[model samples]
Target: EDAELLVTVRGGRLRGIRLKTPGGPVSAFLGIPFAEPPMGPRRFLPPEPKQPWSGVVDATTFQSVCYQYVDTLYPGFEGTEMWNPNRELSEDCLYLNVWTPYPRPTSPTPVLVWIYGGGFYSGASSLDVYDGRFLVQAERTVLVSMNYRVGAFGFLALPGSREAPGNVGLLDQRLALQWVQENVAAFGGDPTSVTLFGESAGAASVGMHLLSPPSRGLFHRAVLQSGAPNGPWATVGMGEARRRATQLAHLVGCPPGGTGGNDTELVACLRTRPAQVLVNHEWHVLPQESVFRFSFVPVVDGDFLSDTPEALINAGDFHGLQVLVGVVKDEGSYFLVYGAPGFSKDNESLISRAEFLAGVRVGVPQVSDLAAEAVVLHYTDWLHPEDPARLREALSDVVGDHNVVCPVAQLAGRLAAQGARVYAYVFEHRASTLSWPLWMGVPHGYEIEFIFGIPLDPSRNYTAEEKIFAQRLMRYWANFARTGDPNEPRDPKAPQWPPYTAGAQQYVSLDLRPLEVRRGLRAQACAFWNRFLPKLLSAT
Candidate 1:
């Protein structure tokens, strides 16, 4: 059935390459634009459909990346192989790529569309790690990943909608999904059975889709990795965002017209400003006001999202969709090291009670010193009075629980209570071979290596044990994609993955051991967090 693999999409005819895999050959269609170029007139506006193309578009090479600042957050490592972006960057990078084992528009395989996370400011579909070959070959389903706008271009809103409606980048993603639902069958994918998933900000985006009225029913299932809408960095203060947008416009030499009259001129002027100029200017709404240092996140515009993720989830406004949510063992190690400089091993400066309260103030500005002291006393290491490292480790645990583990538990508990099928996970396997060193626990995004097949680099290559674990993890994910359940009659030999329940919380731990089922993950710690600060906030 190999007669020059060609498919005609909504825009035009395209040719894809056939790559040999362990499970036969798969067709790889790289870099097909899903929306009109978000350049010039449409810079800060919603994404529009791409006009038709005449000749066959060569869908073989990876596409250019959406405009973003080069990632400089990871301390002690700058431009290493892991953090580097392989593709060139630009504003005209609204595209999606597909991988499928099926040739003709028959058999209609299930689809998994990946949205990447870069803190809502940076991320590209063309990252070296997101290659869909392994997942496509292993799962026997169509896989897709797309580039969405980031930074000021993606999340800018003025006082009103006339200037910028505030979620053009999110609109870019929704537009891409609409394109898929309308045209995925041409590539032998079932429009009905689609799973939307992502890591970090991408995971938050999936949460956004579930909450977005316009985005519901576009996909049937969902998955989140190391992220949720309720996470500290998931959203920005909307007024704070507009202030930055206005500040950015002024910085880029675009002052208000008619002496602060209609915002059309400001919008048009900012659009004319070079894309790189906007991307280069980094900012946050209230760095000191909030614990989260880095800023620029999705706003509560009337259309895309209703309110803060916590508020919406509490109200039960999200769709009753099948979901899988996960977090790494040490989600706070990276941030703890970055947020509190002395905590890193190289610099063993023990934290003081004053420093502890000050650090908590970074994320929870509303938290009183007394409330912060309560957190400090809860995690204090009286047993290891002489050990600073142990205290630092204690600090890491509470931060990890507060930021990732608790949020995951909260999400799972809420979803399970509502009768939606939900599976929870904790990536407990610390990196033994690669050793990037986020200090003593499974770092955030560590699972990305295993989930995306270890990047094909000799130095970053997975060992036999790692490969085995990867295959099993892929099965769990693929099974979840195929059916709502990740474990079932498909693998009767393996332990059944118990769904999350309030009274008896259970999760599958992806450690060196093959799927250890554990219960009440972080129960006491999460219980303390769920009650402590929230109750304190009410009194204030």
Candidate 2:
């Protein structure tokens, strides 16, 4: 079979391309414009439709990733490491890439739309982990990924930012889905059978879309990995987000009255500023009291997102869609390394510090004198666990539970109650390449290696058993995408994986030895947190 190159005028830009695969011949299109470049007058506004191209555009090379400065916290401080090596960052970054098994007249493959994650600030669709060659070859699905605005350009919500409130990133996603609906059939994809999947910030974006009115009918199923709705970092209300943007503008020498200046003039100033200057300026002035700390995130605009997603889901306002949600066993280990340290070494001292930091009093009789110990014990049995490692694991679980796992479990229960299909998972496989020994057990994003079917780096090679485990995981995920159900038919020996319901509460555990139908683990934690944390946090 011969590899074929194809091109189509999308969003008025001539996208370039190439398509060849090991399994068989492949047809690929590259750098398809999904929306107009979000720069100049369009900064911070919703994405506009791409204008039409007059001639055939070469569709071969990748487009520029969104403009972003490097995260200095990470070891390699060079800015080149932030995005695809082949491309540079730019304001003109609204583009997508597609890989089809073969764009034949007979092929109507299911589409898999991927969203990349970088704490809602950095990430691009062209990352190596998202190659999509395996999925397209194995499952014959159409794979699509795109670049979206990030950091200050994507989500700064200044005063008078009302004309184009933040969520340019999310709006870009919506535009991509719209483009898929209009043109995916040309590439042999069923627009109706799309599955949207993402990790970290991308997963959080998926959660937001589940609640956003504009995103309804865009995709049929969602896969949320290691992130959920309801965390302080999830979404901020527009009023507060605007205040933050205004503060940022002041730090950057923009007028205090955000809306008083012309929108175009402000955008021009922002676009011309040095990337490093804007990046450092935003970091220095970010609101530390907010849920996301200093990161940019989706805003809960009253219209697109009427309320918090947790509130919307609980109220049954969301469209009943199939969902696969889960968190890794050590979800916070990565954060412990990369995130700002909020806790101290001594447990007793940390409790007092936490109470002071949260601006509230916390203590319990017969539990522990210190508020931190009490809070930790309330969630996990810390003192009873003799092993120091076990105690640390308990703390990690507490962080994970409050931040991600429990919120997702609650959402699952609510959706299950509404008679929607739900599959819950726990990723327990550990990655070998983690920087520290303490970061051993299934740290955040450990599961991405298996899900994407990429070879682990030489330093982090998977054992023979791990390869088999990865195969099983890919089967489970692809199966879930093909049908609403993830369970494969039982052979002469294998047990049938059941869907989660109120009574059974079956959940799949993705571990070295994978199994299904595990029950009673998630519910108790979810219930306890749901009952106590909200009230406890509210009182504080």
Candidate 3:
């Protein structure tokens, strides 16, 4: 451990450790509180600004992770998700971590604030995979990651004026951004040059921030991976959000019926309840409350999000920040490749012919029986529809399109059309060290392996080729943070990554090397979801 280095933020003196890396030593601030503990009275409310401390509150170790029922034992995710600095848990988890190159730079370095995503329900900033040391060492930038409220505590929209307005989690992020602007400058980050970045739900959160007025001046650019504001899972109507909240309240003994059907009283009752009780009542794997309908998601609260992302974007209601958006080729594979079979009784295979089709049934509840059947027919090997593996592979593509690819395509397409600088990509590389079947392709959340210059498994190190690819990706990303464009002084060896445009419809397919053009990787499939599906839904 290095000596405690004192850095003063708005709240007062904070002490952090330093780490020596190949690039040089870095100031590694593990966990520093950015807000007053959200417990008891503070629970279910917006985050309060952190109060000044008397002395150097030790920032040596990670603070407790925001309470969520994440089972690291889940097969695939644990390799990356399980290893946080500390495995401790608490409701008072409003902390953020930072890594800035040591020997303070005369010029403030660009800041990258990473928002981790676990389907919006679970994730931690302290996770080892997200360690910003290597990125800071190799690339000249200050990296910051924060722990925001998640699950019910983060996103409960009850039905009264005093009731939670939903998106406490997003509000926490907004507050975290404000803190970064105020405090990051002290740690050698150029607050004015902040770039918001995240994968999955965290990516979706950044997209929401683009449309949120409260976040207008927080960050100058955004890098969204694997998800977007338009993803069906990103924002739910307040009606659905409140219904989920009511059901949850009843589950945890704060039933609205028992509280005389008063929304205010019910909110108060739930607020008084212990954190563990709410945590226990939170959603787990299942069709329990129907799995397809994601609860504990961000809601269309008028303040954070005035409307659905499409409506606002259409109305020109967002900060026109330069954005780099991308997703994996097989974004849905992680959900079912093997872990999904664990859900069914009879030990049914997750990708079995019947199970995959059933998943389609559950996945698109908005579509009619005919539309669902049409979708099945489109992806199915009609000649050998009964072949389990063949159908399963097709099903994987279907899930990827529905959950990630299409929405991101729609988002990038619209944003590009809106005249914002949009750099689009698809992470199509797979690791040889991975035991998971290659058919799974580059599964959702796999890009992090390349993005962070770290391997997912310690035993399985990146190949020489993979390291070169990672460095290239990091170079492109770091350049984006320093400037709005991913390619400024473009690498001569690497192909020029063209900005996405409605005219040509090209994207950089990031593989072992990057390719500039693909003319829509899944052109027709994207058209179905991006062009036809929306019109069909609205008409129906």
Q: What's the count of clashing pairs in each model shown?
A: 2, 8, 2
lDDT of 3 by residue, 1-540 (tens): 243277888888888888665556778888798899988877888899999888888887788988876554434544444533246778989999888876765688899999998877788898766878778877878999999998888987773445687788998999999999998888889999999999989999998888887796898899989988888778887777777887787887775453385677778888878877787877641233223245688887676777888887767632366889888887776555333432321233335676766767655655677777778877888798878767666766777787788888878777778767788888888876654555566777878867876642235467878877877888889999998888856567757888877678788888885575777747778787777777766776
lDDT of each: 0.76, 0.66, 0.77
Q: Model 3 residue 422 lDDT? A: 86
| Candidate 1 wrongly placed segments (more than 4 Å) | 1-4, 20-24, 73-81, 102-105, 256-258, 284-286, 289-293, 317-320, 343-358, 363-366, 433-435, 438-440, 455-460
- In terms of lDDT, which candidate is stronger, 1 or 2? 1
Candidate 1 structure quality by residue, lDDT tens digits, 1-540: 556478898789999888665556678899898888888988878888989999999998888887777756555563234545668888889989988874543788889999998778888877767878777776678888888988777887774666587778888889889988988888889989999889888888888888777887689999988888777667766677777777777777777445662478788888877888887665633435433344567887556777777777777733457899998887766666556635553455477655555555553455577777777777776676446666666666766777777877888788778767789999888765544554546766778767765533345555678777777787778888888788854667877888888778998898779678899868988887786768876787
Of models 1 and 3, which has the larger lDDT? Answer: 3
Q: When superposed on Cα atoms, how far off is each prediction in RMSD?
A: 2.8, 4.9, 3.1
How many clashes in candidate 1? 2
Output the worst ten-in-a-row residue range by lDDT, candidate 3. Answer: 284-293
Instruction: Give all TM-scores, in the order shown.
Output: 0.92, 0.85, 0.92
Model 2 lDDT on a 0 to 1 scale: 0.66
